[PDB]
Design a binder for this molecule. Structure first.
Ligand code: CLA
Ligand code: CLA
Ligand code: CLA
Ligand code: CLA
Ligand code: CLA
Ligand code: CLA
Ligand code: CLA
Ligand SMILES: CCCCCCCCCCCCCCCC(=O)OC[C@H](COP(=O)(O)OC[C@@H](O)CO)OC(=O)CCCCCCCCCCCCCCC
Ligand SMILES: CCCCCCCCCCCCCCCC(=O)OC[C@H](COP(=O)(O)OC[C@@H](O)CO)OC(=O)CCCCCCCCCCCCCCC
Ligand SMILES: CC1=C(/C=C/C(C)=C\C=C/C(C)=C\C=C\C=C(C)\C=C\C=C(C)\C=C\C2=C(C)CCCC2(C)C)C(C)(C)CCC1
Ligand SMILES: CC1=C(/C=C/C(C)=C\C=C\C(C)=C\C=C\C=C(C)\C=C/C=C(C)/C=C/C2=C(C)CCCC2(C)C)C(C)(C)CCC1
Lengths: 80, 40, 73, 744, 73, 143, 69, 140
């Protein structure tokens, strides 16, 4: 599977969760930004690696990073 | 009007105008003084 | 002819591999604190100058050599 | 301007101004805020005509499209008038008309400077210029042009028409802008395009041929010389001047209305063959053909119901066609072709490119213009030109089919119609097309590889040749035989064959051959299967791009990504070039490949088994001595006896009037190699290099405010494919022109 | 020989520019300030941030191979 | 004395003379070939008959490279300096970008005309101006 | 301590404007790890491929800024 | 437990489930509709959702999520009560989306934080400092 890490430079704009096409990310409560929330990656076994969460990220260089790892049926996006 | 001048002052218009002007300069120079490989 | 071509091709491959392994060292093995302010760190510290001046010399050479060839043609 | 019609326009929707000319990017809200990065510039050109991304009003889009059509027609009028004026005051059309068989058609004189004056080679009669291959002189002789002043008058008329079309575009986008209701009158538009544009056009052209082309050419072929022919209108002022050539004219138009048509057999013939004097189609045959086509189109222009109850409703016809295999059938297609511009554009591009390729194939073997078959350069040039136009139009048809799929496709209105079921078994379609392409590739190119390996090993008897294991195209030979037996049997009144390419007499004009039987053997079978293979691969790419634009097993939400997008990230193993635009990108390369092999086949076969000289014995000596049969069966044959051999004219063209062809040869090679850089790399490396150069400019405070950005992935692909096609097509252009101009 | 030695100079300069730019940005740039975290060879970083095709130093090696073959040609 | 023994002056090279007897007219001048044959007989030719150029640096061949080099250096410095000063004056116009796309014609012409003194204004900005910028004030990427 | 209008240089290394100059727009209250809002004149890289411009604002901390005026 | 709902009105296609659904895994989307409507199938072509409950089986999770986004972004009464599960060949059913009955776009209590780094991006350890280990800068 792929790793999806989130860093303290998160502002909690929820855009990466809205952009995710496989429900890998969640908005959990936090106390490090104004929105009082941070991104999380609970369902990483469904990550394909399309980098949409990074594309929808506003911080100067992303606060959410996707690292492509061991490939499986779910990560390769296979319907067969 | 002012928009016509602003269109005439765009990047492609100005660049093609300067390129045509320089083309004319060089073409006429080589027409009246041709085959100038080197300076005597 | 075959010997000259063969060994020049071997040399080209070896040079490309050398630079590939230099980049691989930079990726995997480079230590910034044990090599701080030394020659390596300075090479990295003005990398924009080196790359830009290589760009200039390359543009220079290519522009003018291709121009001379096309003029002759 | 109603006249009890269905016309509905807006008297003043758009004011006329010049201020927006000073705001580059007014049509795009993302570009109106001004540039910040260099990409802003490129996108400004990418969305220039992308009217859908500029406004969501179908009416305004239709108005922009109508005025753009008028502007393009003005541009084509300007180009046609330029050609006519260059034939008028810059060509040897009269010196050529006085003696065609001993002079080369020249036009476009070059200013003697920097050495370029060498390009004005002697073409005959003391004229010095560049030999033209567009065949304009043959067309003008077919039209009956005798005096350069008439070419000047045609140029003036064309410029007046260009001004008219431009004024019409301005008037219908700013003054009287027609409503969306007016464009959706497909029945009326069809009736008029069949009867008014096509029917009346061919009718008037048949009239012009009967009154100008036919009499003047009848005399011209008999050696009366141009300056001694009366003017075209002296034939209308003097009816006896028409009756002396065609006694059928002496009876007037009385036999016409009384169905006494046979009387008109003097000038309305069915000869079928070629004119023995000039090697073109009989102008009597072409006039008869235009008359028949005009009547057909006029009768066709009455089918659809408009404002009088009689006629056919295309919606009822489409919805009435449904069977056990296809569900609800063509239901909803009326709504598609009425509310979507891209669907119309795709259908029309496809059929127009096919028509263009058909034009090429029908003009190479049935030379319609006088003295065009003698000139091999003009023949080859027109063939390959229409071939490439058709190929590009077909690729564009695929592009717009995909664009419709992404933008105008509505699943709520396509419930179990033909399009729905196609989307529901696209997997079967594409898998079977994949297999068919593989089977053809193995069984066409693989046969060439077999022949190469067998010949290389010294085993000629194991090859696929006419002398070993034959692959006789039996069916095409049978059809050619049927064509050569049609006049007198299955074509009773036709005097000769439709074309001598199927067989018959080896018609030769002057010292060269015009058209002889084109034999078909093992190599022809192999080349035709190569053609089928390449066409199938290109169609596979384009059809898969169209059918999978909305979704796939990889990307179930591809439609939301749009028609033009680079990818959806390196995930799912990698999803590059999954978009329909990228399918158009690949289909461009495969169209280039297909058409290149087609035109190479055309050139070699014509030069080998058709084109040549004829000595006063009946014996024909071809250009390259019939080497097609024994050499066009291996790849080494195409490399040596076609590319290596026939490029000798192009490479040794320096120091003559054809040195420009060697220059452009090298230039096309260079542009192909240059495209390779955009085709093999990625944007990130170039953006890092630009970052370093931007630092360097920051060192001296030369940093532009518009930040330099590397070309986008899609733009990198577009640039690469554009340069690839340009370089390759220009290379083969120079090669073909030099070769066919250095074979006599 | 003068013209072709300048062509050889262009080839060497451009191939070395590719390789050096790849090795010096292998640890990072302004598109991927953490390119070292992803390794010497990776597909890319996605279409985001403008597009990141051929970003790794391995892609610089693969690019430089073409220019090396051209130089040897 | 015997420098460049492989080359001989074009007048003393027989191949060059034979070819120059048939040099081609360039422009509408029928003597363009004749005047070219007369002008190229000055330089050194090779065994084939075409002139070779000498960039060794000696002032006997100062026209072969030195003078075109000086001319191009002057003109390219002019272009670069006028463009740079135009961009820098653009920098302080609130909307510099859309003036970089839409060229301010009067300001551009005023910068261009005052370009004949570029080699002096260059050292003027280098001595205590804005020609060279401190490295620490320039944006860079991670090392 | 920084106020609105403070021209400052970014020291975040990984930042697109590291070494560039940006003007402070507002400073959020305590608690937040990166409160200093800095707007810029040069847009960064953000946006899908082929997009127009980028983002010209980001939140940093006091320690990541060098003060100018 | 047992997934309920009427299958959408569909004539069939070649883009649906393959051998994976019975050998490996499958997915299911359920949703309630205010009327018989027409929607687009993630596997190609149009289908008709029934008024009331609808159950649909798909091959991949991204397909169900695409259907969910379409339900919630393309219809006048937005369908947002959709649920996505994963079905195994043993008949087992694993509820998936939305994880805690609330969409992940908006914050909700009870959720833990995973993959959250206390440090900055540029504060990752240098690879040489963790070499000859089975970890990468973004993992320690
Ligand atoms: C770009 C600037 C430029 C300059 C400074 C000149 C310079 C000159 N031109 Mg010229 N001209 C130009 C552009 C230019 N030309 C272009 C683009 C064309 C093509 C339409 C011409 C066509 C032209 C004609 C027809 C004539 C000149 C003539 C002349 C000479 C008077 C003079 C030295 C005259 C000349 O030299 O007589 C032969 C003259 O009759 N030129
Ligand atoms: C003939 C093919 C070709 C050409 C011309 C180029 C051109 C160039 N490459 Mg390239 N490259 C190629 C093949 C080619 N490449 C291939 C196949 C690959 C593998 C993918 C690469 C990969 C590659 C890399 C990785 C790099 C380059 C670099 C460069 C640039 C270096 C500058 C130089 O060499 O001198 C000068 C330039 C030239 C000789 C070519 C341009 C000359 C033209 C003709 C000038 C005229 C412009 C014209 C008038 C514009 C108006 C056109 C108008 C009619 C529309 C240069 C512009 C290096 C670079 O960017 O350096 C900074 C770089 O790092 N190339
Ligand atoms: C349809 C497009 C088209 C194209 C591609 C050409 C192409 C060409 N024309 Mg033509 N021409 C055209 C339309 C076109 N023309 C039309 C519509 C007319 C009628 C007004 C003419 C009337 C015309 C004349 C009178 C002349 C040309 C000339 C030329 C050549 C040089 C043009 C030049 O440098 O002028 C100047 C360029 C600038 C001012 C810039 C050139 C190859 C010249 C030529 O052939 O020289 C012998 C020339 O004398 N053309
Ligand atoms: C007999 C009537 C008639 C005629 C001849 C045409 C002809 C044409 N139409 Mg039109 N159209 C008609 C009826 C007609 N239409 C009706 C009733 C409608 C309403 C439903 C439309 C709505 C329509 C639309 C929306 C569009 C067209 C377009 C076109 C042009 C595309 C084909 C082309 O480029 O060919 C070759 C081009 C030419 C031969 C140029 C000549 C054009 C002239 C000005 C028209 C013919 C002269 C005129 C009839 C006067 C003749 C008098 C005299 C010669 C006897 C074409 C010239 C398309 C277009 O604009 O393409 C540019 C387009 O967008 N038509
Ligand atoms: C739009 C096409 C067109 C045009 C405008 C004309 C125009 C003309 N025709 Mg013609 N004609 C046409 C088509 C056309 N015809 C066709 C298709 C045929 C073949 C059936 C004929 C065969 C024909 C004959 C036999 C005669 C004319 C004649 C005439 C002239 C007087 C008839 C009246 O009017 C007239 C200028 C008469 C004439 O004056 O001869 C020159 C004449 O006798 N026409
Ligand atoms: C009647 C035919 C027709 C019509 C009206 C359209 C209409 C449209 N097309 Mg389509 N298409 C066509 C034919 C047509 N096309 C053909 C023949 C092809 C095959 C190549 C395509 C392939 C295609 C693609 C891939 C795309 C479109 C797109 C578009 C839309 C944007 C237009 C645009 O790109 O702006 C203006 C065009 C340009 C800036 C391109 C200029 C590049 C030039 C022509 C380089 C060519 C060189 C030149 C011919 C010779 C060399 C000269 C040089 C040396 C100076 C537009 C509504 C785009 C879209 O997104 O659709 C919504 C898009 O992505 N089309
Ligand atoms: C000469 C160069 C070349 C060749 C070899 C191919 C090969 C192929 N391409 Mg391709 N292509 C090329 C260039 C080439 N491409 C380029 C430059 C591009 C970029 C635009 C593309 C992009 C492209 C696309 C988009 C597509 C193809 C497709 C195909 C396949 C067509 C199906 C077929 O013909 O069956 C098979 C034919 C062959 C394998 C040819 C070789 C057969 C040899 C003679 C037999 C070998 C004997 C034996 C097996 C050897 C054993 C060795 C021993 C040691 C064991 C085919 C394998 C289409 C496809 O996938 O088809 C469905 C397709 O969609 N190509
Ligand atoms: C060697 C000697 C043997 C030769 C036999 C070759 C013919 C056998 C295979 C032909 C396919 C028959 C199906 C079409 C006959 C046909 O269309 O039937 C009609 C049927 C639709 O008819 P409907 O009854 O629905 O008609 C109502 C319509 O008005 C509404 O659409 O089409 C289909 O069944 C879909 C299947 C098409 C998919 C098959 C296409 C395969 C391509 C074949 C290419 C080979 C020749 C190409 C030359 C250009
Ligand atoms: C032998 C002839 C050669 C034929 C080659 C044909 C190449 C076909 C390539 C397919 C793409 C074509 C569609 C482009 C439309 C398109 O979308 O292309 C693709 C690309 C789109 O990139 P993006 O996806 O990033 O754009 C999205 C933006 O709209 C973001 O909002 O656009 C560009 O290539 C930009 C470069 C423009 C270059 C500006 C130069 C202007 C030339 C002026 C002269 C024109 C010629 C006049 C006629 C003589
Ligand atoms: C003469 C001679 C030669 C050569 C020599 C040499 C080797 C030289 C050099 C040199 C060098 C080694 C140089 C370097 C440098 C550096 C720098 C640094 C410069 C530049 C700068 C700047 C700063 C600029 C500026 C500007 C201007 C002024 C104008 C335009 C704009 C601009 C901005 C670009 C030869 C042999 C060929 C021949 C004989 C003799
Ligand atoms: C004149 C002469 C002489 C002399 C010579 C000399 C003195 C010199 C040499 C020179 C040299 C001396 C040269 C060079 C070479 C170089 C090269 C070949 C390159 C490179 C580099 C690289 C490739 C790198 C890599 C890396 C990286 C990138 C990073 C990390 C580290 C490393 C290293 C890994 C004599 C008298 C003897 C003899 C006669 C002649």
């Amino acid at each position: 599977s792929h790793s999806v890490k989130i860093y303290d430079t998160c502002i909690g704009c929820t855009q990466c969760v809205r952009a995710c096409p496989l429900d890998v990310l969640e908005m959990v409560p936090w106390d490090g930004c104004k929105a009082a929330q941070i991104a999380s990656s609970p369902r990483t076994e469904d990550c394909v690696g399309c980098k949409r969460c990074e594309t929808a990220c506003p911080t100067d260089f992303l606060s959410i990073r996707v690292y492509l790892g061991a490939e499986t049926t779910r990560s390769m996006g296979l319907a067969y | 009007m002012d928009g016509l001048k602003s269109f005439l002052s765009t990047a492609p218009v100005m660049i093609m105008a300067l390129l045509t002007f320089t083309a004319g300069i060089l073409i006429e120079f080589n027409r009246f003084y041709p085959d100038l490989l080197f300076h005597p | 002819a075959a010997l000259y071509t063969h060994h020049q091709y071997i040399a080209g491959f070896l040079m490309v591999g050398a630079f590939a392994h230099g980049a691989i060292f930079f990726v995997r093995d480079y230590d910034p604190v044990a090599n701080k302010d030394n020659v390596l760190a300075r090479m990295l510290e003005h990398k924009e100058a080196l790359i830009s001046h290589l760009s200039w010399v390359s543009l220079f050479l290519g522009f003018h050599t291709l121009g001379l060839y096309v003029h002759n043609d | 301007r109603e006249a009890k019609a269905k016309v509905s326009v807006d008297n003043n929707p758009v004011p006329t101004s010049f201020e927006k000319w000073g705001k580059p990017g007014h049509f795009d809200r993302t570009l109106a805020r001004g540039p910040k990065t260099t990409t802003w510039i490129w996108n400004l050109h990418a969305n220039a005509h992308d009217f859908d991304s500029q406004t969501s009003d179908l009416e305004d889009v239709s108005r922009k499209i109508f005025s753009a059509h008028f502007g393009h027609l003005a541009v084509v009028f300007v180009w046609l008038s330029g050609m006519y004026f260059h034939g008028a005051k810059f060509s040897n059309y009269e010196g050529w008309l006085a003696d065609p068989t001993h002079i080369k058609p020249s036009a476009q004189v070059v200013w003697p400077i920097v050495g370029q004056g060498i390009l004005n080679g002697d073409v005959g009669g003391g004229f010095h210029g560049i030999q033209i291959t567009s065949g304009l002189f043959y067309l003008w002789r077919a039209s009956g042009f005798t005096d350069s002043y008439q070419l000047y008058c045609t140029a003036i008329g064309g410029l007046v028409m260009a001004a008219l079309m431009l004024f019409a575009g301005w008037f219908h986008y700013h003054v009287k802008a027609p409503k969306l209701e007016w464009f959706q009158n497909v029945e009326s538009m069809m009736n008029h395009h069949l009867a008014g544009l096509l029917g009346l056009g061919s009718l008037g052209w048949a009239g012009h041929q009967i009154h100008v082309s036919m009499p003047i050419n009848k005399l011209l072929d008999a050696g009366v010389a141009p300056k001694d022919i009366p003017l075209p209108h002296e034939f209308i002022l003097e009816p006896s001047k028409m009756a002396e050539l065609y006694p059928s004219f002496a009876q007037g138009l009385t036999p016409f209305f009384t169905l006494n048509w046979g009387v008109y057999s003097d000038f309305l013939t069915f000869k079928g063959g070629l004119n023995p004097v000039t090697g073109g189609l009989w102008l009597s045959d072409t006039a008869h053909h235009h008359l028949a086509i005009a009547v057909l189109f006029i009768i066709a222009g009455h089918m659809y119901r408009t404002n009088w109850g009689i006629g056919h409703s295309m919606k009822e016809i489409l919805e009435a066609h449904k069977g056990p295999f296809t569900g609800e059938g063509h239901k909803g297609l009326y709504e598609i072709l009425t509310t979507s511009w891209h669907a119309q554009l795709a259908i029309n591009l496809a059929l127009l490119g096919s028509l263009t390729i058909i034009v090429a194939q029908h003009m190479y073997a049935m030379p319609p213009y006088p003295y065009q078959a003698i000139d091999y350069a003009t023949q080859l040039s027109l063939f390959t030109h229409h071939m490439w136009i058709g190929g590009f139009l077909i690729v564009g048809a695929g592009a717009h089919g995909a664009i419709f799929m992404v933008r105008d496709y509505d699943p709520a209105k396509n419930v179990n119609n033909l399009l729905d079921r196609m989307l529901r078994h696209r997997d079967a379609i594409i898998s079977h097309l994949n297999w068919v392409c593989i089977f053809l590739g193995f069984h066409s190119f693989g046969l060439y590889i077999h022949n190469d390996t067998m010949r290389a090993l010294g085993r000629p008897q194991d090859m696929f040749s006419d002398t070993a294991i034959q692959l006789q195209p039996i069916f095409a030979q049978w059809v050619q035989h049927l064509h050569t037996l049609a006049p007198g049997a299955t074509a009773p009144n036709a005097l000769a064959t439709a074309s001598y390419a199927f067989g018959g007499e080896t018609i030769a004009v002057a010292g060269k051959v015009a058209m002889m039987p084109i034999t078909l053997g093992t190599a022809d079978f192999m080349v035709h299967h190569i053609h089928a293979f390449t066409i199938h691969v290109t169609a596979l790419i384009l059809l898969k791009g169209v059918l999978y634009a909305r979704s796939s097993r990889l990307v179930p939400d591809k439609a939301n990504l749009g028609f033009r997008f680079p990818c959806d990230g390196p995930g799912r193993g990698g999803t590059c070039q999954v978009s329909g635009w990228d399918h158009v990108f690949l289909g461009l390369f495969w169209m280039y490949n297909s058409l290149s092999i087609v035109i190479f086949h055309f050139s070699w076969k014509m030069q080998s088994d058709v084109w040549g000289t004829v000595s006063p014995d009946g014996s024909v000596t071809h250009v390259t001595l019939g080497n097609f049969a024994q050499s066009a069966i291996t790849i080494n044959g195409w490399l040596r006896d076609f590319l290596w051999a026939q490029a000798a004219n192009v490479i040794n063209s320096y120091g003559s009037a054809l040195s420009a062809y060697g220059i452009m040869f090298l230039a096309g090679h260079f542009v192909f190699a240059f495209s390779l850089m955009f085709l093999f790399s990625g944007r990130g490396y170039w953006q890092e290099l630009i970052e370093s150069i931007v630092w360097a400019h920051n060192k001296l405070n030369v940093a532009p405010a518009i930040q330099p950005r590397a070309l986008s992935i899609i733009q990198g692909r577009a640039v690469g494919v554009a340069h690839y096609l340009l370089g390759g097509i220009v290379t083969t252009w120079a090669f073909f022109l030099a070769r066919s101009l250095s074979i006599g | 020989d003068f013209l072709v030695h300048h062509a050889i100079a262009l080839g060497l300069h451009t191939t070395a520019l590719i390789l050096i730019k790849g090795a010096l940005d292998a640890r990072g740039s302004k598109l991927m300030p953490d390119k070292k975290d992803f390794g010497y060879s990776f597909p890319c970083d996605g279409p985001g941030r403008g597009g990141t095709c051929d970003i790794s130093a391995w892609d610089a090696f693969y690019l430089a191979m073409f220019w090396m073959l051209n130089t040897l040609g | 004395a015997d420098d460049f023994a492989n080359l001989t002056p074009c007048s003393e090279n027989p191949a060059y003379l034979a070819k120059s007897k048939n040099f081609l007219n360039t422009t509408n001048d029928p003597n363009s070939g004749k005047i070219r044959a007369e002008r190229y007989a000055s330089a050194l030719c090779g065994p084939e008959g075409y002139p070779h150029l000498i960039v060794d640096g000696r002032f006997t061949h100062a026209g072969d490279f030195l003078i075109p080099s000086i001319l191009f250096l002057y003109i390219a410095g002019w272009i670069g300096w006028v463009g740079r000063s135009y961009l820098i004056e653009i920098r302080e116009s609130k909307n510099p970008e859309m003036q970089e796309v839409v060229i301010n014609v009067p300001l551009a012409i005023k910068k261009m005309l005052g370009g004949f003194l570029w080699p002096l204004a260059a050292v003027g900005e280098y001595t205590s101006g804005k020609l060279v910028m401190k490295d620490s004030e320039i944006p860079t990427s991670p090392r | 301590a920084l106020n609105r209008g403070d021209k400052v240089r970014i020291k975040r290394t990984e930042s697109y404007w590291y070494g560039d100059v940006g003007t402070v727009a507002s400073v959020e209250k305590s608690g937040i790890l990166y409160p200093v809002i800095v707007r810029f004149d040069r847009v960064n890289y953000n946006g899908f491929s082929g997009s127009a411009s980028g983002v010209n604002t980001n939140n940093f901390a006091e320690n990541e800024l060098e003060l100018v005026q | 437990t047992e997934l309920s709902g009427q299958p959408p009105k569909f004539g069939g296609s070649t883009g649906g489930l393959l051998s994976k659904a019975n050998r490996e895994e499958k997915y299911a989307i359920t949703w309630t509709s205010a009327s018989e409507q027409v929607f687009e199938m993630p596997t190609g072509g149009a289908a008709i959702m029934n008024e009331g409950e609808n159950l649909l089986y798909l091959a991949r999770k991204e397909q169900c999520l695409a259907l969910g986004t379409q339900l919630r972004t393309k219809f006048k009464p937005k369908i947002q009560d959709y649920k996505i599960y994963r079905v195994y060949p043993s008949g087992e059913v694993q509820y998936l989306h939305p994880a805690d009955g609330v969409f992940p776009e908006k914050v909700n209590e009870g959720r833990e934080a995973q993959g959250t780094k206390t440090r900055r991006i540029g504060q990752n350890p240098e690879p040489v400092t963790i070499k000859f280990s089975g970890k990468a800068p973004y993992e320690v």
